[PDB]
């Protein structure tokens, strides 16, 4: 029927209060700084390397992505801040690679482009990490991969951190062999010079495109056969497009230049015989009833000052409609049912510390969502897990483990958004990075550590006073200042959003307006895989 | 004689093309199962950055590059040579004709939009302008060796002969068929390497020219 | 998106060249002869038996088929040339039976009609073979069978060739018992006189229609009970419609005359609760850009003169669009992706002899098509398998076995079209009759043998010179002429298209224009069964 | 076949024998070096096990 009226969330804030104005100014400053940093990352390796890249007749890699995807279609780029201030004097913009979810020939694909302007396409350790994260996104969501290979091989003085381990360079080819065994298409466009580790990327792909007189594939290049076997060969007749396309048979399609390679790639994606079938129910999409710079006014940048998570849900969901679940029992967790772009979402949001009743409310909700096949969105703003004595007497760590066990075992698409702090085992109760969410974005005011600075300094000082009390002497003000300096400094440095996305601990720092769009994009990509039945473990009652 | 298009007219041609591509996107979506979904809106919304599309339109004989920035509010900022235009608009239908509704720097206009193969037609009350879309090379592009180990049937040429391209040079029968060697080359046959009746071998030279 | 432009195949031929004019005249002569032969086959047993058939008030069997199928609907008739000059002085038109795929009540069915004007509906051995081929088409493609039984029992002096073996008359009832165990409906309309082997056809069917005072079912007729038990009975009260419809219960529906039986059959097909569900992707159909009498000009009738198979693909596929796969590696095999009537087709066509690289290209392509669930169309024009010494040194028979093993194991719908010669183990590499294609049509210029004749005569002569060289004497010109006469004569006689479709070695000789339509019809029938996952054997690398 | 055994100087595998390449391509080859056990077991890779004689 769906004609009967309901109520909506959200209230209009006081635009003149000094709290709102200060919060708006702080979050506007953070978002402007985020914008200028990513505009510097957008250039890549500087204008010298871009000039020498277009002097050989190639496109720049973002031009390749713009010409590959559908015209006017959005592009969800993942981990734009990988490698940011990570290596000591080396600048690696974007990680040295560009990964994203786009729309090619009406199919949502994962696109992995070697940005060859930075370090000649060398593979730093964060490059391997960011590429492996893109590949596990594409295997989880069942998205075809398009690799735009312009590589340079594995860096040498970091070779340990690139070569042998489980989640090191060789995993890449493992992920190609397994995805193609599940009918997840791999397409490689060779636009560069694949030297001996990159050379396995087109040879492990179902269909190749290589560019005339520009793309080269060899298991051992000219200086490599020089140092290994002692031989001089020219590169374009050692591994050029003519040899591979006509004699050896490594390549399947042959392109004149980069525009022809991208046109052929769109043809290849169209001949994949793929049709997206949905299993959730869809309703007409509707925009909310409130703007999204109000989120700048509401959230701010002060993590010591709490707010209400219902104001955020009011500004990201369809029509600001929200069916709340158990609204009075355990009210530091907000659970409910909403819709984003017509998709049904179960939302779990933090509003305080986690008590025992909040964790039981969350476990009931996650079982409900897995029984009905409804995707989950976690909105992390955590400070703790209620330390105390009357709390451990009840079973608080008996109740947060049920929350952890239900979030781990859940087989629906889960997406996390960290809108505030995220500390301790609370981070595990609300689907942190270890619990395999499909995506995990953060806002520019977030913090993530094990216990925040003050607490770690206090615990270390009190345990070393206890420890030294086998003999026992104090250095009171000296120990205080000399432990409260380098621990607060370290925890505030490593809790930053740029510190955590300089690694690949999340999928991006996003602007609080763009939030709604980004969730919709992620949720539609996450619906390419059919939702499987959930089996839970043993709930410890 | 034909007159050059104004930069505002190139903005209208670029906008009509972009909106036509959107129309194709919309009619694909209407046939999709995944309806109402994002990606269907041709908004060009990149994350944290803007998207600029570089297209080239051919005005008569000369090419003009137009850099189209997709704005968050649905407008376009089109920079043609150096000058930036604020370009907004949409399509609407009246009967069986499609019209392009434009607003360029606050100046509203209306023209009929017809796109036939490569040519963009804009019919207005001040004239008619034809802008062409360039065609990329890969859509407009369309000595000898013995193929199999077979016996030679007939040799057509001698040492010292002058032939043309697409001319019968040697014939060989291989197993079940008949494959004539013909010349792509130019020049003079100095050498008939195989006598008549001999057995040539795959990927081998039959005739050499100096 | 699907809006971006692509290129198409094909070039317009020289209509004035003597090659084109001679080829057009030869293939026009072959097609006119095919038309007049099938118009003579259309009459059946002559005008005497047709007059005595309509004097008893029955329809002719092609009239029955025209009144059974949907009005204006096409009819794909299978094996119109069965029994053509096969028995020495007996003429058996059409095999004595009419099989075809038609459209009844909006469902595509297999129709098997006993043509009772020829030999009183007797079952010759080619009649059993043609009927069993129709039944295995209907079991493979999951099509309901409608038998229009007007039989006469199994011929007597050919009784060995009809009775005991595995693929002899009794298999018919096996195929009814298994198809009906898979929910593939059997419907039998008894319009004739089923004598003791035909009597099991309506009794093994789920629903019967028998005609008042015309259809009779008995396990032993009046002369049969005379010779077996010694009894005189009248036939219409031994096994007529009234006894079976009212007392014994063999029949389920009772018809007044043939029009009532066909109307009731359309009702019965409508109550089958069948709904056709597609699993491939469909696009808007589009006609090609070139005519189809150009195929007469291009192919001709000279099998020693080669042509290009891309000219054929240009004239049978949607819009003449074709995405070629590995176009420069192994260029005597043309593989690619096209569309026929909106269905995705992977096409494999011969352009020369099979080398090793061509067979590897084909194996890669067939694995690609089975991974994506794309149907296959093989276009056979074969002469061999590259005999040589440097070829056996590489592993040519190591590489054609991979092609054979991939074509055999493939579980997508495969359709073969023989447009030229088809000799040797090359015939097995390109999905011959033994490799279970759904359908296999031929053009009127085709040839199929184990070799080409000259080769067989030469091998036999050189082998007998070697054999006699234990003592050794020659009969040079005598042996030459006396082995080159009766071997070239035999191989050219048995390689004919009419020789091969006089047996049931294929599903029809078709006109090269009609090709496109016939493929579309076959492909839509082949999509009634859901495509299953392919398991391959061991690829010998 | 998944696994082969071919016998030294006795078993021969070829897609076109000596009179067949004679009548098809016009070539004279010896049979034991066109398709013998040594070529297939050491170069082409058609055979997997190599036997001395029938008991082996
Ligand atoms: C470890 C392995 O897996 S084997 C790797 C084999 N090494 C290579 O093939 C890389 C060397 N060659 C090249 O990079 C080829 O010239 C190309 C085509 C890939 C790059 O083209 P060019 O731009 O001409 O290469 P160029 O010499 O300019 O390299 C640019 C930078 O990349 C560096 N580089 C490239 N590959 C590597 C690598 N594997 N390790 C360390 N540095 C590398 C170069 O030292 C150079 O120095 P820079 O960091 O100061 O800029
Ligand atoms: C015993 C067995 O299971 S094997 C044979 C089946 N058993 C029989 O009853 C054989 C006798 N024939 C019959 O079955 C029936 O009586 C029928 C169908 C022939 C009766 O058909 P009618 O409409 O009366 O036509 P008629 O009987 O004249 O048959 C026409 C011709 O076909 C031949 N014929 C028909 N059925 C058979 C048969 N089963 N075996 C051999 N010849 C047959 C007849 O010899 C006759 O010869 P002709 O063509 O040289 O004139
Ligand atoms: C900052 O996050 C405040 C202190 C952290 C709370 C501590 S850390 C480890 C314990 N686990 C938990 O959920 N809370 C406790
Ligand atoms: C006519 O078809 C020419 C000669 C046949 C080639 C021979 S026949 C048996 C061998 N197998 C094969 O594929 N080619 C060889």
Q: Which string of DSSP letters, residue by residue, matches C478-506?
A: HHHHHHHHHHHHHHHHHTSHHHHHHTTSS
Confirm if B120 and B13 have CB atoms less than 8 A apart.
Answer: yes
The chains found to touch C (3+ Cβ pairs under 8 angstroms) are A, B, D
Option in C3, C7, C303 nearest B24 (CB): C3
Decide if A132 contacts A168 (C-beta within 8 A): no
Cα separation, A43 vs C18, in Å, equals: 63
Report the SS3 class of residue C161: helix
Cα gap C200→C190, rounded to integer Å: 11
**Ligand 1 neighbourhood includes A152 CB (under 6 angstroms):** yes
Eight-state DSSP code of residue C532: P
Does B138 lie at the interface with A, CB-CB under 8 angstroms?
A: yes
Q: Cα–Cα distance between B52 and C19 in angstroms, integer?
A: 55
Would you give the DSSP letter of residue C245? I
* Parallel/antiparallel/unpaired status of strands A333-340 and A447-449: unpaired
Tokens of A314: 């009011």
Touching B (3+ Cβ pairs <8 A), the chains are A, C, D
Experimental method, per PDB record: cryo-EM
The tokens of C439 are what? Answer: 């359908």
Backbone angles phi and psi of C70, in degrees to 5: -65, 150
Judged on CB neighbours under 10 Å (0-12, 13-18, 19+), D55 is exposed
Structure-token pair, residue A129: 């990490």
Least Cα distance to C430 among C381, C357, C463, C392 occurs for: C381
Q: Is residue A448 classed as helix, strand or coil in its secondary structure?
A: strand
Q: Which residues contact A43 (CB under 8 A, 6 or more apart)?
A: A50, A93
Tell me the three state secondary structure of residue A382.
Answer: coil
List all residues 6 or more positions away from A16 whose beta carbon is below 8 Å from its beta carbon: none
Token pair belonging to A376:
């989950």
A212 Cα distance to chain centroid? 35
Contact criterion met (CB below 8 Å) for C131 and C112: yes
Specify the 3-state DSSP secondary structure of D32. helix
What gap in Å lies between CA A104 and CA A274, rounded to an integer?
12
CB atoms within 10 A of CB A48: 9
Q: Virtual CA dihedral for A10, A12, A18, A20, nearest 10 degrees?
A: 50
The neighbour count for residue C125, using CB atoms within 10 Å, is 23
Are β-strands B150-155 and B199-200 bridged in parallel, bridged antiparallel, or unpaired? antiparallel
Residue in chain D lying closest to B197 (CA): D26
Interface contact flag, C458 D23, Cβ < 8 Å = yes
- Residue C88 is classified by DSSP as S
Contacts with C372 from chain A: Cβ below 8 Å:
183, 185, 272-273
Distance from CA of D18 to the nearest CA of B (A): 13
Q: Copy the structure tokens of residue A122.
A: 């060398």
- B195 within 8 A of B151, measured Cβ to Cβ: no
Cα distance between the two ends of chain B: 53
Tokens 């029509």 -> residue: A319
Q: Which residue, chain included where needed, has tokens 């002369």?
A: C223
Beta-strand (E) ranges in A143-183? Answer: 145-149
CA distance A203 to A239: 13
Tracing tokens 């309703």 back to the chain, one arrives at A283
Q: Sort A425 into a burial class: Cβ within 10 Å, 0-12 / 13-18 / 19+.
A: middle
Is residue C278 within 8 A of residue A275, CB to CB? The reply is no
Nearest CA residue ID for atom 14, ligand 2:
C152
Q: Which residue from C minimizes the CA distance to D31?
A: C389
Strands C323-325 and C343-350: unpaired
β B150-155/C186-190 pair status? unpaired
A48 contacts: CB under 8 Å, gap ≥ 6:
none
Whether residue D44 and residue C538 make contact (CB cut-off 8 A), yes or no, is no
Distances in Å between the Cα of C206 and the Cα atoms of A364, C69, C105, C172 are: 53, 20, 18, 15
Contact A372, A355 (CB under 8 A): no
Helix H or strand E encompassing B91: strand B83-94
Residues B72-107, buried b or exposed e (16+ Cβ, 10 A)?
eeeebebbbeeeebebbbeeeeeeeebbbbbebeee
Write the CA distances from C282 to B28, C260, C337, C517, integer angstroms. 13, 38, 14, 17
Determine contact, residues A420/A390, Cβ cutoff 8 Å: no
Asked whether C426 and C382 are in contact (CB, 8 A), the reply is: yes
C-alpha span between B41 and B19 (Å, rounded): 11
Contact B25 A80 (CB under 8 A): no
The two counts, helices (H) then strands (E), for chain C are 21, 17
Closest CA to A365 of A286, A455, A447, A429: A429
Spatial separation of the C-alpha atoms in residues A327 and D44, rounded to whole Å:
75
B176 part of contact set with chain C, CB < 8 Å? yes
Cβ contact A515:A292 at 8 Å: yes
CB neighbourhood size of A496 (10 A): 15
End-to-end CA distance of chain C: 40
Classify the C-alpha dihedral C88-C92-C96-C102 as positive or negative.
positive
Number of Cβ within 10 Å of residue A405's Cβ equals 18
A426 CB near ligand 3 (under 6 Å) = yes
Other CB atoms within 10 A of residue A500 CB: 23
Q: For residue B85, give both structure tokens.
A: 């235009």
What residues contact residue A325 under an 8 Å CB cut-off, 6+ apart? A335, A336, A337, A361, A365, A368
For the residues of B112-139, what is the DSSP string, one character each? EEEEETTEEEEEETTEEEEEEPPPPGGG
CA distance A145 to A131: 11
Integer CA distances (angstroms), B174 to B179, C249, C298, in order:
8, 67, 22
Cβ-contact A61, A116 below 8 angstroms: yes
Contact C275, C530 (CB under 8 A): no
Point out the ligand nearest to the CA of residue C221: 2
Ligand in closest contact with the CA of A195: 1
- Checking DSSP bridges between strand C193-195 and strand A186-190, what pairing results, if any? unpaired
Chain C interface residues (partner A, CB cutoff 8 A): 1-2, 4, 6, 280-281, 323, 325-330, 337, 344, 357, 360-361, 368, 371-374
Supply A289's token pair.
């009833």
Q: Ligand 3 pocket, A432 CB below 6 A?
A: no
Residues C366 and C347: their CA atoms lie apart, in Å, by: 10
Q: Which residue has the tokens 């070779």?
A: A159
State how far the Cα of A285 lies from the Cα of B178, in Å rounded to an integer: 66
Chain position carrying tokens 């949907």: C70
For chain C, the helix, strand and coil percentages under 3-state DSSP, each to the nearest 5: 40, 15, 40
Strand locations in A168-242 (E): 186-190, 193-195, 207-211, 216-218
Contacts of C281 (CB under 8 A, 6+ apart): A273, A274, A275, C344
Q: How far apart are CA C256 and CA C269, in angstroms?
A: 19
Sequence-separated contacts (24+) of B132-136 with Cβ below 8 Å: B132/B57, B132/B58, B132/B59, B133/B17, B133/B57, B133/B58, B134/B56, B134/B57, B134/B58, B134/B63, B136/A259, B136/A260, B136/A263
**Distance linking the first and last C-alpha atoms of chain D:** 19
The closest alpha carbon to A280, from B33, C280, B28, C278, belongs to B33
CA angle A193, A194, A197 (to 5 degrees): 155
Residue nearest to atom 38 of ligand 1 (CA): A155
Q: How many CB atoms lie within 10 A of CB D30?
A: 10
Sheet of A207-211: strands edge to edge?
Answer: A76-78, A97-104, A107-114, A145-149, A186-190, A207-211, A253-255
For residue C424, give the ligand nearest its CA: 4
| Residue A117 token pair | 């302007």
With beta carbons less than 8 A apart as the criterion, state whether A251 and A210 touch: yes
Nearest to C150 by CA among C268, C44, C237, C37: C44
Backbone angles phi, psi at C100, to 5 degrees: -170, 165
- Let me know: does A442 contact A378? Beta carbons within 8 Å: no
Q: Which of C321, C324, C328 best probes binding to A when mutated, by most A CB atoms within 10 angstroms?
A: C328
3-state percent breakdown (helix, strand, coil) of chain B, nearest 5: 10, 50, 40
Resolution (A): 2.8
With beta carbons less than 8 A apart as the criterion, state whether C488 and C453 touch.
yes
Residues 6 or more apart whose Cβ sits within 8 Å of residue B3? none
- Measured distance CA(A525)–CA(A519) in Å, rounded: 10
B159: left (phi over 0), alpha (psi -120 to 50) or beta: beta
Backbone angles phi, psi at A219, to 5 degrees: -75, -10
Half-sphere exposure of C417 (CA within 13 A, CB side): 24
Residue entry with tokens 């909310």: A288
CA–CA–CA angle C329, A145, B34 (5° rounding): 120
Question: Which bin fits D3, alpha (ψ -120 to 50), beta or left (φ > 0)?
Answer: beta
Query: What is the rounded distance in angstroms from the CA atom of residue C343 to the CA atom of residue C527?
Result: 10
What are the two backbone dihedrals, phi and then psi, of residue C461, each rounded to the nearest 5 degrees?
-65, -45
Q: How far is D56 from chain B (nearest CA, A)?
A: 37
From the number of C-beta atoms within 10 Å of its C-beta (0-12, 13-18, 19+), residue B117 rates as: exposed
């Amino acid at each position: 029927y769906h004609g009967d009226s309901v109520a909506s969330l959200g209230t209009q804030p006081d635009l003149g209060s000094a709290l709102y104005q200060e919060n708006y100014k702080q979050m506007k400053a953070l978002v402007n700084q985020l914008h200028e940093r990513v505009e510097h990352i957008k250039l890549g390796g500087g204008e010298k390397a871009r000039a020498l890249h277009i002097s050989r007749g190639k496109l720049l890699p973002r031009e390749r992505i713009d010409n590959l995807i559908d015209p006017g279609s959005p592009f969800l780029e993942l981990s734009q801040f990988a490698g940011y201030q990570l290596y000591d004097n080396e600048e690696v913009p974007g990680g040295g690679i560009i990964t994203g979810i786009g729309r090619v020939s009406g199919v949502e694909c994962m696109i992995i482009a070697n940005d060859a302007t930075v370090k000649g396409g060398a593979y730093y350790p964060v490059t391997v990490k960011k590429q492996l994260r893109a590949q596990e996104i594409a295997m989880q969501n069942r998205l075809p991969c398009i690799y735009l290979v312009d590589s340079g091989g594995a860096y040498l003085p970091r070779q340990a951190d690139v070569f042998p381990d489980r989640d090191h360079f060789g995993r890449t080819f493992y992920n190609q062999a397994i995805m193609s065994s599940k009918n997840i298409a791999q397409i490689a466009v060779v636009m560069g010079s694949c030297t001996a580790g990159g050379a396995y990327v087109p040879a492990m792909a179902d269909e190749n495109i290589i560019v005339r007189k520009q793309g080269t594939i060899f298991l051992a290049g000219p200086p490599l056969v020089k140092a290994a076997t002692g031989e001089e060969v020219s590169a374009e007749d050692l591994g050029g497009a003519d040899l591979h396309c006509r004699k050896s048979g490594v390549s399947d399609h042959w392109a004149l230049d980069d525009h022809h390679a991208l046109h052929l790639t769109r043809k290849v994606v169209r001949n994949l015989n793929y049709q997206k079938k949905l299993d959730v129910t869809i309703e007409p999409s509707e925009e909310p009833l409130f703007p999204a710079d109000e989120l700048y006014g509401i959230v701010g940048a002060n993590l010591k000052r709490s707010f209400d998570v219902r104001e955020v849900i009011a500004r990201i969901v369809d029509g600001s409609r929200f069916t709340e679940f158990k609204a009075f029992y355990g009210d530091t967790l907000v659970t409910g049912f909403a819709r984003i772009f017509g998709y049904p979402v179960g939302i779990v949001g933090n509003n305080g510390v986690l008590f025992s009743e909040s964790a039981k409310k969350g476990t009931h909700f996650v079982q409900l969502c897995c029984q009905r096949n409804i995707p989950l969105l976690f909105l992390q703003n955590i400070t703790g897990f209620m330390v105390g004595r009357e709390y451990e007497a009840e079973g608080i760590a008996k109740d947060g483990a049920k929350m952890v066990a239900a979030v781990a075992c859940a087989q629906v698409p889960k997406i996390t958004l960290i809108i505030g702090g995220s500390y301790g085992a609370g981070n595990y109760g609300m689907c942190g990075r270890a619990y395999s969410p499909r995506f995990l974005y953060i806002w520019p005011n977030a913090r993530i550590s094990v216990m925040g600075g003050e607490q770690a300094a206090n615990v270390l000082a009190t345990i070393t006073k206890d420890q030294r009390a086998r003999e026992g002497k104090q250095f009171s003000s000296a120990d205080e200042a000399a432990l409260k300096e380098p621990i607060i400094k370290k925890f505030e440095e490593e809790g930053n959003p740029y510190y955590s996305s300089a690694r690949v601990w999340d999928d991006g720092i996003i602007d609080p307006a763009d939030t709604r769009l980004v969730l919709g994009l992620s949720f539609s990509a996450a619906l390419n895989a059919p939702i499987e039945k959930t089996d839970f473990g043993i709930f410890r009652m | 004689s034909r007159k050059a298009a104004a930069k505002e007219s190139l903005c209208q041609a670029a906008l009509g093309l972009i909106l036509k591509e959107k129309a194709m996107t919309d009619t694909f979506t209407l046939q999709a199962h995944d309806q109402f979904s994002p990606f269907s809106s041709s908004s060009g919304r990149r994350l944290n950055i803007s998207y600029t599309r570089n297209m080239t339109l051919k005005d008569g004989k000369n090419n003009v590059a137009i850099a189209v920035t997709y704005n968050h509010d649905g407008s376009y900022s089109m920079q043609i040579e150096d000058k930036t235009f604020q370009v907004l608009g949409n399509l609407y239908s009246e009967g069986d004709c499609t019209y392009l509704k434009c607003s360029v720097n606050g100046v509203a206009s209306k023209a009929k939009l017809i796109i036939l193969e490569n040519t963009i037609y804009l019919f207005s009350k001040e004239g008619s302008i034809e802008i062409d879309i360039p065609v990329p090379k890969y859509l407009s592009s369309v000595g000898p060796l013995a193929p199999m180990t077979g016996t030679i049937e007939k040799v057509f040429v001698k040492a010292g002969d002058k032939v043309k391209a697409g001319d019968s040079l040697m014939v060989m029968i291989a197993m079940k068929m008949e494959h004539t060697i013909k010349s792509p080359k130019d020049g003079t046959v100095k050498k008939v390497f195989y006598r008549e009746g001999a057995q040539a071998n795959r990927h081998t030279p039959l005739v050499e020219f100096e």
